[PDB]
Amino acid sequence: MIHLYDAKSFAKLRAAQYAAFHTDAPGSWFDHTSGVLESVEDGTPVLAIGVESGDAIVFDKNAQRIVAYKEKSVKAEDGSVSVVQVENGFMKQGHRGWLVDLTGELVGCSPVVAEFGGHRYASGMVIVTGKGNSGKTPLVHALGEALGGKDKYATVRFGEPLSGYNTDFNVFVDDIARAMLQHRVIVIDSLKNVIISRGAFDLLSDIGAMAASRGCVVIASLNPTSNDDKIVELVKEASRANSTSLVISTDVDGEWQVLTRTGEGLQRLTHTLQTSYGEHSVLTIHTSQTVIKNDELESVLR
Amino acid sequence: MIHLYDAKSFAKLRAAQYAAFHTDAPGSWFDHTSGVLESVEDGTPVLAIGVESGDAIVFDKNAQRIVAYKEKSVKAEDGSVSVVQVENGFMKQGHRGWLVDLTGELVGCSPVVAEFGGHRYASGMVIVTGKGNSGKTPLVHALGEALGGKDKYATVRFGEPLSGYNTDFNVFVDDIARAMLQHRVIVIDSLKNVIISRGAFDLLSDIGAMAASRGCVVIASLNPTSNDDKIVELVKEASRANSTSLVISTDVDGEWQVLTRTGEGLQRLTHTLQTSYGEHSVLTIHTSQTVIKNDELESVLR
Amino acid sequence: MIHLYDAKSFAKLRAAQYAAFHTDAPGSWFDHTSGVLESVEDGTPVLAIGVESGDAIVFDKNAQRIVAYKEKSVKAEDGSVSVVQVENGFMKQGHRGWLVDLTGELVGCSPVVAEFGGHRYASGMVIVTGKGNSGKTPLVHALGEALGGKDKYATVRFGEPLSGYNTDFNVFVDDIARAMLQHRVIVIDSLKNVIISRGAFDLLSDIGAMAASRGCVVIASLNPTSNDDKIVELVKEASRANSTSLVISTDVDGEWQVLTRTGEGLQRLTHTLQTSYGEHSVLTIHTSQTVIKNDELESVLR
Amino acid sequence: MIHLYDAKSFAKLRAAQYAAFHTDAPGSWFDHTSGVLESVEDGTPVLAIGVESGDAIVFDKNAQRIVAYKEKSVKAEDGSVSVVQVENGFMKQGHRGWLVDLTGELVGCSPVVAEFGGHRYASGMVIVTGKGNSGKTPLVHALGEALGGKDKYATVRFGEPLSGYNTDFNVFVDDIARAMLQHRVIVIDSLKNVIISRGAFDLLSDIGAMAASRGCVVIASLNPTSNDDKIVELVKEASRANSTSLVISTDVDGEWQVLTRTGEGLQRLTHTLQTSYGEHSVLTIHTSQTVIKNDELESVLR
Amino acid sequence: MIHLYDAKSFAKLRAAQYAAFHTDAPGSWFDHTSGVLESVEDGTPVLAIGVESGDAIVFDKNAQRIVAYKEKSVKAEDGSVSVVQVENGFMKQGHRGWLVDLTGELVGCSPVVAEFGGHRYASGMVIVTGKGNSGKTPLVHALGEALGGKDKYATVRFGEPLSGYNTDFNVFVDDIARAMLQHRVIVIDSLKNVIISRGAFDLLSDIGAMAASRGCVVIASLNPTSNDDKIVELVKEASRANSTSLVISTDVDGEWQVLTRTGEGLQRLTHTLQTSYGEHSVLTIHTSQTVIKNDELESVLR
Amino acid sequence: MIHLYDAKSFAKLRAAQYAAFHTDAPGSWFDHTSGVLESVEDGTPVLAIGVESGDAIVFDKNAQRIVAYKEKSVKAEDGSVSVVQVENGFMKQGHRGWLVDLTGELVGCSPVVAEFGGHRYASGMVIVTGKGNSGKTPLVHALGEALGGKDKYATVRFGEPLSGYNTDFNVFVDDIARAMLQHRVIVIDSLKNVIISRGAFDLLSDIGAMAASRGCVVIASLNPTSNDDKIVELVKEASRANSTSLVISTDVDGEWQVLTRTGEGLQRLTHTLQTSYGEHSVLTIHTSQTVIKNDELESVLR
């Protein structure tokens, strides 16, 4: 919805946003939103996500598709009315994104998803990219396990020439929807085939917001290597603009730079990861805050 | 409508447009247009705005959508006939923009929206942009507050990978219509996902005129960095041609240049802002005429 | 129609075209075509112009839209059959442009619209363009007043982020049609949002011929400053070939070059204007035949 | 249709093609095809030409539109069947071009249309283009009169900002069809607005063939000056590939180079024209064979 | 169908493809396929070819179109089922190409079409191209005659601004289907207007395989000069990938290089032709193995 | 499906993936999935693949097209519902790829397809490419025979100007589907006319995953020699990211580099092949683990 501020209420929002990353218990926002989701009336539509066509499919709290649902309208504080209607397996009225209110007045946060190696990590979309020798897929899995902590991470596999990989975009959207409804830490391997359709353009623009609203993290690899003067800027956009956090390989083998948006209008933070390989290419992130500026951010985006 | 002029009536127009920026009481135009919208017969359409598909949706004076409204024609001075008709939630006849008269014969104004720090600010669309180290989001909120003055400012949130951010363009047009129907000072964060569809193209081309006609100011951040021939120049277009005022970061950290169109055929003004951060990234604009010359404008652009 | 010539009838035509610019009383063609229009039967279609979709809307002599009109055919003298039919507001059979013959055998003229400051100006489309510091909007209004002479000039406003500006293309084609039907001197501010749709493309390629056939002048500002490799050339097309005259700013502030097509196959004339501002940015063109070659014209067009 | 040759019948075709340009009485092919046309059964469709949409309209021998015509099939020598059917003013079955056989086995000719100044000129499409100071429009008219000889030439006017100029492509197609059905020498001013739609692409590709088949000449001006890396190669294609003859301005004022395709596989010829202006810009071509090679042809196309 | 091989059966295939070019009697494949087409049950569809819209039209063995033909399925060796169905003049089920089996297990051949001047020539598509002074049209006809030998060659004429030239793409597909159904040696003048539509794209991709399957040769001229990134490289594609043999002009006037694919996986051969003109531009190829090495091929291209 | 991992189950997966390439008996995954397919109910859909339009056609285990199949849903173990329905020959509900689960929890493998000359080869898509003198078609057939071992390999032929080559995309997807259903070793000659439609785009992005899931190998030649700025990069995409292995020609004639993805997140291997020709261009690969880094892989990809 729209929100109204004065100096005092604005200062209160920024303190709340700052807390949401810096001092909240890691993973507490996710537990909170899981509570909101479980308390919705049994058959309420909770999430809509674009399929390849630009149509939207709709899910309930248990990540089952809604196929038919008769018009229902809800009135917000700002006077806005939201109306949801599903017909023949597709949204007739509504919008893409969360169909129930997960946030209230607390918007523009990067809720802390996990702490690891003495650093807090933000929920939302994490793009793992870069150029050079360091392998993206082993890193996404290392980070999934590490931010998972005591919990298992969910793996969505898409668009690679390997066994059991789904290559149909509509199944991909179904996987991702289910992952965000049911798990705090999610890995996507890979965004290669997404980076095209209206659905594909909807996902890139939606997923960070959906994830941050939930308090889950989606850790996605993206090889920028299609080296054409159109796709290569869909990649740099994706990474600059469409991500909550960026994990970029460096000059040095096994070393990665993590750049984090900590919230709306807040400082972007940075830290480095050192990594090494064990048996069967299982990567370990070694374990035992620094602000980055828009000059140094565009510098790393190179 | 069309308007006819001779030397004398043209001189009067120019005097009145001058006044509308320079000597009218700040915010007086907004109050006048608020009174006119309050007096409209209750279920009259007052505003049409383009949705993503290029179709238009229509609102009444309380920012609720009009689903059905039977043909109604009105005759203007110049002889022209304006018609409005809404059917199954969409404009069947009419045009985008204000559907009742707020401006009268007085057209081509940049009505003063507020005065702050010894500077008058125009209503219409303010684009906050630039490259370099200064943060756009903190600035739009600092301006929102400052121009709000005694009044709270409204925040429309769109297309950023953060909690609670809407990413559906149609919800966004809803938010913006409600904002303009109900508040003098409005912030949009951000224009990145708009900068595409027919609706997106419509919005960029319509919003400044809508705002200026109302006497409200829409303050929007625009990241120019997408760096390709299509979008990088669609951004310079937007800032050059589709904006009433421009706020651009400079060489010096925390410093910004404000470039203001004062009305139809009138001179563009310029002034500088100095800023500083307090706690939790809250920005303050320090407070305790200069014309720019069309080639110095092209210099500022880039 | 098609016309047939031998050496003798061609010489006569060229003499008549020459006279239409050089010796006819200024504004006489306008009064002539006003008479032709006034003689047209009361609900007969006289003008069709393209809307955004590329469909055409149709007007009668009093600038009212025709909603329904039964198929009627008319036999021209070359043998051609012209059929007009209007259904549900849109032309179903016919063509864009004048639907009645304003011109006869007297075709390919640039009929003199006015004389000012010792110089004759042509009807048709006048594009006011160039770069540098001289302001286009003040100049189009100054020309408007100056060529209006004893008569008021009409102003069509479109696509600027200022109060009361229409931004809907279809309202815009409605305004221009009414203006050409009812007024000798017309200003458009501005062609910006036009330079896109089929309708936009149709307007650029129709309006100079429509105006010259009427004997009215359409004075339109075009800012070329949008430096896209595509669009920077659509401006030069518009100016080079879609215009009867060009008014371009020079190296010297306040000074403009006027380049005039005097008729079909005839010499293009050039002259300079000196200008100055008074109060509230009201510009005055100072007062008290030079042929220009191609290449010199292309030099100008850079 | 398809034609079968051996060495002997091929040598006979080439001698006939050579004669068709070099020794036939000038304008005799046109008289012959006028005879074929007048001897067709009264209501037979004789010509189909693409309108803007890519649909085709159909004409009879007297250049009147056929609106309804029931399927009729004709068997050629090669066994091919041609079938014509018109429905609701548009061709349902058939092809674009001549619908009656004007040529028989005598195909691939550039039939001589006229002789003037001691040089023979080919029927088909003549594009008058080039860059520099020499005026195209006065030359097209000079050439029309000169090749007209004892006959008047027909002028089709299209897409210029001057009085009485049609700007609707479908009326343009009607004009051109009528011109080729009824006159040996035809001038088009200009191809500017053609050089786009499917119809526009159909015309460029068809008109030379239609004209050569008839034995009429279509003399069309084309300013190449749209200087964009797409339109500018539609122009060079148009001129290189889609023309029977090319008339190109030179280094020297008033001087033109004429380059002629004399027939299928035959030599391209070249000669120069000297010209001067009289009163009211009426141009005279001064009056009282040379082969050109593909190296020198691409050289002139520069 | 698919074919299965082991070492031994693969060796046999390669021997038989070798033979099909090197030791079979010239023209024997054409006679074999002629017998097979003669024996087909009378109204069977034998050939489908793409029209402009991407739809396919279907012919019988006498080159007459099939308007209606009810579903009929046939089972292949590999288990695959081929179906053919024609409805209102268009293929409803089936594929483009030959609709009965002419090649058998022997696939991937360039069957020898003729021998001339001590050189064997392949069936399939021969593209005659190049820059420089040598004329393409005279050469395609000289080759047509020479390869025809005792037989006349067929000429398909398309898209040149000369008398009798068809310019309708659908008539062209008709001509070409008839040519391949009925003659061993075929000339197309020219490919310029094909080099676009779905049908045009289909033809370029299908014709060489159709011809080679039949054992006929299609000799087509292609002017490469259109000089833009889209078409100039679509031409090099056509000549590189879509052609069975290539004939390219050289440095030296009248001299040409012939580059021949001899079959699937076999070596490309090369030889040179010397030529001279007699009367009326009739070209003679003088008569009274060399492999090219893939990089020498890329050298010849350009 | 989605899968959930903690450190322990992830280590197990990576060990299983490692074994699937390095220690499983060559060709065992193929025989395993043959068993899964053989267990499928007699007319159950097992595979869907995109046709040219972007619609999907559907096959049963014996490679027969399914024309009609009533909606049937199946519940996966992650909770996902998979619904299949076929109507009028086309998939109405479902997804592209395998419609039955061939892989289980064992996903992200490059299952070993064969061992030859002391080296293990992976199933999936193998693209044979590069520039220079070494011939791609001979090599794909040599690999076909060599990896077939005791079994015959299947050859799908498409889009070459040679006898019996299918050029219809839809027959081509039919061939590939049948090949993957019935054979472990498959050759495609060639991918040329594929590298366009939605179907072509779908194939490039589906076939490596389909094959690897089956445990078959598709060996496809791709000539990059089409040097368009657009297409030269679609080839590198195809090769970089759409392939399980790459076979590229080197500086040295007859010599090829093999680059093999060994599984999800695992090291890429490299080895060299030496080759020679015998009679009728039959190539022999000579007989009697080196990891490769990124950057070295990009060096190769130039």
Ligand SMILES: Nc1ncnc2c1ncn2[C@@H]1O[C@H](COP(=O)(O)OP(=O)(O)OP(=O)(O)O)[C@@H](O)[C@H]1O
């Ligand atoms: N034991 C190891 N030592 C060093 N590097 C390894 C090891 N195991 C894997 N890698 C690296 O990680 C990569 C595995 O991931 P993958 O093959 O998917 O490549 P990627 O860089 O993730 O991107 P993509 O798959 O999109 O090309 C390998 O290319 C390899 O370079």
Ligand SMILES: Nc1ncnc2c1ncn2[C@@H]1O[C@H](COP(=O)(O)OP(=O)(O)OP(=O)(O)O)[C@@H](O)[C@H]1O
């Ligand atoms: N306390 C602070 N000191 C210095 N800079 C700050 C501080 N707080 C915020 N900023 C700057 O303000 C910006 C926060 O806003 P945001 O993250 O939205 O970036 P932006 O410049 O608005 O552009 P975008 O979001 O489009 O990338 C950051 O770039 C950050 O560097």
Ligand SMILES: Nc1ncnc2c1ncn2[C@@H]1O[C@H](COP(=O)(O)OP(=O)(O)OP(=O)(O)O)[C@@H](O)[C@H]1O
């Ligand atoms: N009093 C004045 N003295 C000098 N120049 C002036 C004066 N008044 C206006 N101008 C010039 O004329 C312009 C007014 O026209 P406008 O603001 O519409 O810009 P423009 O040059 O017409 O182009 P655009 O509107 O497309 O930016 C001013 O921006 C300024 O450049």
Ligand SMILES: Nc1ncnc2c1ncn2[C@@H]1O[C@H](COP(=O)(O)OP(=O)(O)OP(=O)(O)O)[C@@H](O)[C@H]1O
């Ligand atoms: N008396 C004359 N002396 C010299 N040149 C003349 C004379 N009359 C006309 N011309 C030239 O011929 C041109 C008339 O034709 P026109 O104005 O249509 O230009 P064009 O070169 O034909 O092309 P376009 O109209 O498309 O720009 C003039 O521009 C002028 O340069």
Ligand SMILES: Nc1ncnc2c1ncn2[C@@H]1O[C@H](COP(=O)(O)OP(=O)(O)OP(=O)(O)O)[C@@H](O)[C@H]1O
């Ligand atoms: N007697 C001759 N001596 C020398 N050259 C000749 C002779 N006759 C014809 N030619 C050449 O052959 C060509 C005739 O064919 P045509 O006009 O079709 O040209 P082309 O090279 O085939 O290309 P296009 O028609 O695509 O421009 C001319 O270029 C001409 O120079």
Ligand SMILES: Nc1ncnc2c1ncn2[C@@H]1O[C@H](COP(=O)(O)OP(=O)(O)OP(=O)(O)O)[C@@H](O)[C@H]1O
């Ligand atoms: N006996 C041989 N000795 C040396 N090289 C050979 C021999 N036989 C074939 N080749 C090479 O292999 C090629 C056969 O493959 P093909 O003709 O299909 O070309 P390609 O290199 O596979 O690519 P494309 O077909 O796309 O042009 C020959 O053109 C030649 O370059």
Ligand SMILES: [Mg+2]
């Ligand atoms: Mg990877």
Ligand SMILES: [Mg+2]
């Ligand atoms: Mg921001």
Ligand SMILES: [Mg+2]
């Ligand atoms: Mg202006």
Ligand SMILES: [Mg+2]
């Ligand atoms: Mg001209």
Ligand SMILES: [Mg+2]
């Ligand atoms: Mg030729």
Ligand SMILES: [Mg+2]
């Ligand atoms: Mg090959």
